[PDB]
Amino acid sequence: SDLQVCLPKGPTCCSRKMEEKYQLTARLNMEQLLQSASMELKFLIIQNAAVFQEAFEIVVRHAKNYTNAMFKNNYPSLTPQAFEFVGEFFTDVSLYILGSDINVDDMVNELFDSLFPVIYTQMMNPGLDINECLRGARRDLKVFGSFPKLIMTQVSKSLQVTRIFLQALNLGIEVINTTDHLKFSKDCGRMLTRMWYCSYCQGLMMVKPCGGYCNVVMQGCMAGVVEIDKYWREYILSLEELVNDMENVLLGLFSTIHDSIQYVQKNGGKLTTTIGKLCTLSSRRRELIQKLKSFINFYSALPGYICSHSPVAENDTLCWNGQELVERYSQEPVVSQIIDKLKHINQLLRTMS
Ligand SMILES: *[C@@H]1O[C@H](CO)[C@@H](O)[C@H](O)[C@H]1NC(C)=O
Numbered sequence: 001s002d003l004q005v006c007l008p009k010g011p012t013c014c015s016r017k018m019e020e021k022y023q024l025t026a027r028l029n030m031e032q033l034l035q036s037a038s039m040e041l042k043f044l045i046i047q048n049a050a051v052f053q054e055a056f057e058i059v060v061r062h063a064k065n066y067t068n069a070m071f072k073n074n075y076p077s078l079t080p081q082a083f084e085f086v087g088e089f090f091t092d093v094s095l096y097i098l099g100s101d102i103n104v105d106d107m108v109n110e111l112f113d114s115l116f117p118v119i120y121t122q123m124m125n126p127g128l129d130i131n132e133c134l135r136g137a138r139r140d141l142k143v144f145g146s147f148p149k150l151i152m153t154q155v156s157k158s159l160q161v162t163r164i165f166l167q168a169l170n171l172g173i174e175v176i177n178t179t180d181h182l183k184f185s186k187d188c189g190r191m192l193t194r195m196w197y198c199s200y201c202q203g204l205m206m207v208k209p210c211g212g213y214c215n216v217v218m219q220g221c222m223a224g225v226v227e228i229d230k231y232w233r234e235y236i237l238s239l240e241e242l243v244n245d246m247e248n249v250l251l252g253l254f255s256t257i258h259d260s261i262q263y264v265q266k267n268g269g270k271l272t273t274t275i276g277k278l279c280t281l282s283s284r285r286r287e288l289i290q291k292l293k294s295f296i297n298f299y300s301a302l303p304g305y306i307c308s309h310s311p312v313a314e315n316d317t318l319c320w321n322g323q324e325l326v327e328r329y330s331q332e333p334v335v336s337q338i339i340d341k342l343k344h345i346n347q348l349l350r351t352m353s
Pocket residue numbers: 061065066068069
């Protein structure tokens with residue numbers, strides 16, 4: 001008589017307060033169903049994100065170790081200072097891989113800025129306050145040739161693809177975790193309450209809602225959610241485009257650095273006088289992608305999941321149509337944030353490869 005959701009066709013066994021209860025369980029039932037649909041995909045990316053993050057850090061640590069080892073072996077006169085700017089470089093390497101605001105060109109530079117004064121003082125002119133004059137002379141006189149720019153492009157290409165690979169996995173975690181927190185319209189909350197519970201208010205014990213009625217209701221409130229599909233697909237294929245490395249580059253840096261130190265030593269005669277006057281991975285991300293491609297239908301199949309895991313009369317016979325038991329059935333802001341972040345990422349993937 002005073003109900004606001006359950007259309008009272010005949011009498012009704014539930015009051016207004018019982019309509020609250022049914023509306024809140026409708027909310028809770030929807031969130032649980034969405035969360036059950038997204039659990040297995042969420043855990044897949046969470047697993048891989050944790051593994052790949054440690055695997056990359058193992059690579060960076062191994063690359064730092066070997067660069068320090070070739071400094072110990074080939075340039076003992078540059079140690080222990082060598083250990084300081086090598087460690088600072090690879091620390092910034094990791095920090096950049098994990099998404100922090102680090103400038104790759106500033107990394108490579110600062111490395112050669114710190115490396116040149118000790119090369120001059122210990123290898124070229126044996127025999128502290130003039131240090132800043134030497135650091136400026138490194139770049140102003142281009143003592144290292146194209147070696148810094150060579151390393152610059154060599155590592156910026158591989159560190160950018162590794163950084164975006166991690167950023168893409170985490171953002172995938174972020175949007176899939178956002179699905180089961182998706183708040184819906186007030187009209188849908190009433191429709192879901194009608195579809196799932198308002199039959200109990202009419203005194204029915206085993207009646208299930210119609211599969212067709214569930215389809216028009218689900219398509220009702222997932223109209224915005226389903227629009228994410230196109231962008232979620234493009235995210236999957238763009239991620240496949242990137243995987244199809246950074247180890248070989250980072251584990252080759254010593255070689256390039258060592259040759260750069262030979263290069264600056266080749267013109268020492270004129271340089272000293274001028275300055276004196278002046279002063280199994282790839283298998284893992286392949287398996288991840290093949291497992292991620294099984295979830296390309298996630299957003300399109302989502303209304304199908306909610307109806308197929310809720311009790312419905314698929315036959316559309318002897319079912320509940322939201323207001324009565326029939327013989328046959330007749331028949332943005334958060335979502336836009338998901339699409340924006342998907343758009344931003346997809347663009348970022350497509351440009352790398
Ligand atoms: C290798 O790296 C680990 C951790 O960075 C360090 O404890 C160890 O001393 C390194 N070994 C060599 C030979 O550089």
